[PDB]
C-alpha cells in the first residue's frame, strides 16, 4: 500500500523516467545490451499508466531527455572542440537539442493518454506502436529530421533481426514497442495474458533470421582496400594540410594498385575543389588503369548551375579501370541529405557571424538529387550514401538497384572524438546491409572503417584513430529481399489500420 502509493507520485515518475530513458542508450553500440531496449520501453509505457493527459506528456518528455540526454550528448564533443563558444552555451545547445528531440516522445505520450486513458491491452499493443510510428516518423522528418536512437537498430544481432529484410528497421521499432507494452501491462495488472502474448509475438520472428533472400556471386569476389587516412579534423581543411593529405592517400594506394581491384578513400578525402586537382586526378587515373585497379574517393566539387552560380557539392568520384576519370564523367555521387550546421547553416545571414560553430569550414554545400544511379567501377555497381545518409533507411532503399553489387558509404566521424557517436552511426549502417542483403563497404577518415556482410555481420574492421588500410576479400550478392521490393508502405498500412482500429474503439 505504501510502496504503491509512493510510485504514483508524479515527481517520482519523472525521476524514474530519466533513469528508464537513459537506460535505453545501453541498447546501442558500443554497449549492445539489446534487452535494455525492452526495459527502457516498458518504463515509458508503464510509467504513463493512469495519469492525466498533460501529466503523461511530462513523463514522456523526461523519458526522452533521459534517452537523448545520455545517448546523443556526444554532439558536445564536436561543439566544444571546434565551436569556439563559451562553456555554458555549449552545454545549453546540447540540452537544447536533447529537449527538442524529447518533444516527439512527449507528444507521443500525451496523445496516447488523452485518447486511450484506460490501461487496456488495446492502448499498449495497438494504439502505442502506431502512434509511436507517427511520432518517431515526425521526429525524423521535421526541420530535416534526426531519427537517431531507434531501438530497432539494437536488434541487429538480437532475435528480431530476421524482421528487417522483410519490413525494415521501423517494423522492429513497431514490434519492440508492442511487446514492451504487453510486458508493461502484464506487470501493472499482474496478468499472465499479456506476458504469454508478448513472449510469443517476440519469439515468432526468430525463425525469420534463417531465410537467405540473397545469393552470393563467388565468381565476382575481389580484393578491396579502404584507406583510413586519419587526417586530424583541426587541420583537415587547412590549406597547408592538402599536400600532406594527398601524399598520405597516394602513398597508401600506389603499392595496392594491381593487387586491390577496388580502392576507397573516405568522405571528402581530397580536400580541394575537383577542378583544382586535374593534373593529380588525371595522373592518378592513368596509373590505376595501367595496373587494373579502380579508386572511389570523396572530394569537394563546385559546379556551375543554370543561373551562372556555383553549387558546391560533397561528392564521390571514380577513377581507373572500368571508370576512366573525367571532369565530364557521370560516375559520381553528390551528397543529398546535408547535416545541419556542419554542412549548411539555417538562417545563414543571422547565424553565420555568431560563432565559428555556425561558420565551420565547408559549411555551404548544395544538395544532390534524392535518387542517383549507382557508382560503377571495374564492372561493380555500388549504391552510395555519404556518412549520415546511411542512417536514412528508406532513402538508401530507394537508390538501391537489383544489379547493385555492394552498398558503399564513406564518412568522416573525427568530429565526435572517442565518444559513442561513431559506434551508434556504425551500428545503423549495419542495418542497411541486413535490410537489402548486400555487403557494405564503409570507408572512414578515422571512424569505424569496416566491411559488413549481407546479414549485418562484421566481416572485417580496423581499429579507430589509426593510419592504416583495411584490405580484405569481399563477395557481392544478388537477389531481392521483401523490404527492397517495397520500402515501408506495408508497415504504414499496418500503422494505419492499427491507428484506425485504435481510434475507433476510443470513440466510445
Ligand atoms: C539500476 C541501475 C539504473 C541506472 C540507469 C542508468 C542508465 C545508463 C546510463 C548511461 C548510459 C550511457 C552513458 C554514456 C554517456 C557518455 C559516455 C562517456 O562518457 O564515454 C565516452 C567514451 O566512451 C567510449 O566510447 C569508450 C570506448 C567504446 C568503444 C570500444 C568498444 C566498442 C564495442 C563495440 C560495440 C558494437 C559494435 C559492433 C560489434 C557487435 C566519453 O567520450 P569523450 O570523448 O572522452 O568525451 C565525452 C564528453 N561528452
Ligand atoms: C532545434 C534545436 C537544434 C539545436 C541546435 C544546436 C545543436 C546542433 C548540434 C550539433 C549539430 C551538428 C554538429 C556538428 C557536426 C559536424 C559534422 C559535419 O558536418 O562534417 C561532415 C560530417 O558528415 C557526416 O555525415 C559524417 C557523420 C555525421 C553524423 C551526424 C551526427 C550529428 C548530427 C546532429 C544534428 C542534429 C539535427 C538538428 C535537429 C533537426 C564531414 O566532415 P568534413 O567533410 O571534413 O567537413 C565538414 C563540412 N564543414
Ligand atoms: C492522432 C492519433 C494517431 C493514431 C494513429 C493513426 C495515425 C495515422 C496512421 C497512419 C497514417 C497513414 C500513412 C500511410 C501512407 C503511406 C504512404 C507512404 O508510403 O509514404 C511513407 C511516408 O509518408 C507518410 O507516411 C506520411 C506520414 C503520415 C503522418 C500521419 C499523422 C498525422 C500527422 C499529425 C499528427 C500529430 C499527432 C496527432 C494529434 C492529435 C513512406 O515513406 P517514409 O520512408 O516513411 O519517409 C521517411 C522520410 N523521413
Ligand atoms: C522550437 C523548435 C520548433 C518546435 C516544433 C517544430 C515545428 C516546426 C514547424 C513544422 C514544419 C517544419 O518545416 C520543415 O522544413 C523542412 C524543409 O526542409 C521539411 O523537410 C524537408 O526536407 C525533408 C528531408 O527529410 C524532405 O523529406 C521534406 O519533403 C522537405 O519538405 C519539413 O517537412 C518541414 O516540416
Ligand atoms: C488494408 C488492405 C490494404 C492492402 C494493400 C493493397 C495495396 C493498396 C494500397 C496501396 C495503393 C497502391 O499501392 C502501391 O503499390 C506499389 C507497389 O509496391 C508501392 O510501391 C511503389 O511506390 C513506392 C513509393 O511510395 C516506390 O518506392 C516503389 O518503388 C513502388 O513500387 C506503393 O507504395 C503502394 O502505395
Ligand atoms: Cl515531492
Ligand atoms: Cl486489458
Ligand atoms: Cl578502362
Residue numbers in the entry: 1 to 508
Please quote the paper that reports this structure.
Lnt is a 57-kDa protein that is present in diderm bacteria. It converts a diacylated BLP (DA-BLP) to a triacylated BLP (TA-BLP) using glycerophospholipids (GPLs) as acyl donors. The reaction is proposed to proceed by a ping-pong mechanism at catalytic triad residues Glu267, Lys335, and Cys387 (Escherichia coli numbering). Lnt is composed of two equally sized domains, a membrane domain (MD) and a nitrilase-like domain (ND).
